[PDB]
């Protein structure tokens, strides 16, 4: 099995799954997509 390897970046997003990615690359590589900015909340 295969992975994608998450860079060092900073300033991370939130996917359209509801959960924090450093970028936009690592929401794509687990199916989801770019929804909202900054890290995202717990659900709180």
Same mark, same amino acid.
């Given at each position: 099995?295969?992975?994608?390897?998450?860079?060092?970046?900073?300033k991370?997003? %939130?996917?359209?799954?509801?959960?924090?990615?450093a970028? /936009? !690359?690592?929401a794509? %590589?687990?199916g989801?997509?770019?929804?909202?900015?900054? /890290? !995202?909340?717990?659900?709180?």
């Amino acid at each position: 099995k295969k992975v994608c390897a998450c860079p060092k970046i900073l300033k991370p997003v %939130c996917g359209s799954d509801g959960r924090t990615y450093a970028n /936009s !690359c690592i929401a794509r %590589c687990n199916g989801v997509s770019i929804k909202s900015e900054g /890290s !995202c909340p717990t659900g709180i």
